[PDB]
Amino acid sequence: MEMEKEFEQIDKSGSWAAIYQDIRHEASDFPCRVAKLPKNKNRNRYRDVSPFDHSRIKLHQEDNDYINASLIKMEEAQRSYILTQGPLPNTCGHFWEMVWEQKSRGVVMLNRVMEKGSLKCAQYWPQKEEKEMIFEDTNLKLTLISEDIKSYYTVRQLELENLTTQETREILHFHYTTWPDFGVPESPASFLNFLFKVRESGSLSPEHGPVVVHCSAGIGRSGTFCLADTCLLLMDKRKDPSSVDIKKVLLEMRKFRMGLIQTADQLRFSYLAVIEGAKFIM
Numbered sequence: 001m002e003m004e005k006e007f008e009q010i011d012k013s014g015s016w017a018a019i020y021q022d023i024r025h026e027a028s029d030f031p032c033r034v035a036k037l038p039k040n041k042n043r044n045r046y047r048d049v050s051p052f053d054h055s056r057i058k059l060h061q062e063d064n065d066y067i068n069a070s071l072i073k074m075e076e077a078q079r080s081y082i083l084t085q086g087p088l089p090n091t092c093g094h095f096w097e098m099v100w101e102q103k104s105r106g107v108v109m110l111n112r113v114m115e116k117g118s119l120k121c122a123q124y125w126p127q128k129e130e131k132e133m134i135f136e137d138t139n140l141k142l143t144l145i146s147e148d149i150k151s152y153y154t155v156r157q158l159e160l161e162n163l164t165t166q167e168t169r170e171i172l173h174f175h176y177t178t179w180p181d182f183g184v185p186e187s188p189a190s191f192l193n194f195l196f197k198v199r200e201s202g203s204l205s206p207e208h209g210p211v212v213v214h215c216s217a218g219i220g221r222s223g224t225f226c227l228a229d230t231c232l233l234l235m236d237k238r239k240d241p242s243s244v245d246i247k248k249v250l251l252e253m254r255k256f257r258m259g260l261i262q263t264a265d266q267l268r269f270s271y272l273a274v275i276e277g278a279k280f281i282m
């Protein structure tokens with residue numbers, strides 16, 4: 001498998017850091033002027049992780065349509081994803097407004113609320129059925145309908161209600177809970193299983209709005225998820241699957257949101273997931 005051979009060549013030459021730096025250097029650079037406006041200071045989690053202006057998701061509210069989220073539109077693969085930061089104490093309402101307005105079916109969370117002893121995002125969904133959440137600023141109700149805790153992930157059914165119209169929708173929350181505090185998973189086995197569990201649910205499908213993906217910053221683990229998914233989809237679609245170049249796909253995705261894949265380790269892991277995903281397929 002051509003990409004496997006490249007993988008093995010980089011391993012042997014110990015050139016993961018160099019390949020990764022090359023991607024960093026070639027990556028797109030677009031303005032994030034809205035993200036930097038003084039009034040949006042409290043809507044951003046990380047100073048160095050902002051959505052580009054051209055691909056940012058706009059809230060359908062008048063005056064301050066800003067949320068730290070980007071639409072990644074993969075034309076050839078015919079897949080779209082919304083990558084966003086983990087919600088802040090003051091942006092949970094915005095987060096669900098976006099889910100509502102973008103017509104998303106699924107939310108993909110790749111972090112734990114607390115990792116390395118620090119808070120990585122707000123507790124933005126209800127943990128108990130009888131204790132629903134109301135987001136007064138965006139007039140939305142959120143109810144935990146069911147929860148299925150598995151080994152490497154937890155899937156939740158949530159009901160999102162637009163209080164203005166009393167319209168309701170079912171949202172699936174796919175929560176990968178086993179990404180290690182340091183480095184990356186030893187085997188891509190569980191992450192691929194998880195990705196295919198998300199696929200199974202219809203959350204990535206054309207009949208729904210784009211899936212909403214986040215980790216703490218919405219670029220590292222999040223990038224890995226969308227990158228693996230897109231590469232595998234392209235391998236199924238093309239007459240020549242060996243033509244799928246992960247570096248090129250990653251560079252295309254970076255036209256839509258900065259920093260996707262934060263480390264050389266994450267790049268290596270992304271190759272691994274794509275290689276093993278293809279081998280399983282087979």
Ligand SMILES: CCc1oc2cc(S(=O)(=O)Nc3ccc(S(N)(=O)=O)cc3)ccc2c1C(=O)c1cc(Br)c(O)c(Br)c1
Nearest residue numbers: 187188189190192193194196197200276277279280281282
């Ligand atoms: C393609 C998705 C996928 O890729 C995987 C890769 C591994 S692996 O890392 O352990 N590698 C691997 C395992 C087994 C084979 S096999 N059975 O072909 O010899 C090949 C490769 C494990 C599990 C999976 C795995 C799945 O769990 C999975 C889950 C669901 Br739901 C699916 O519908 C599919 Br198809 C696959």
Ligand SMILES: [Mg+2]
Nearest residue numbers: 127128129130
């Ligand atoms: Mg209970």
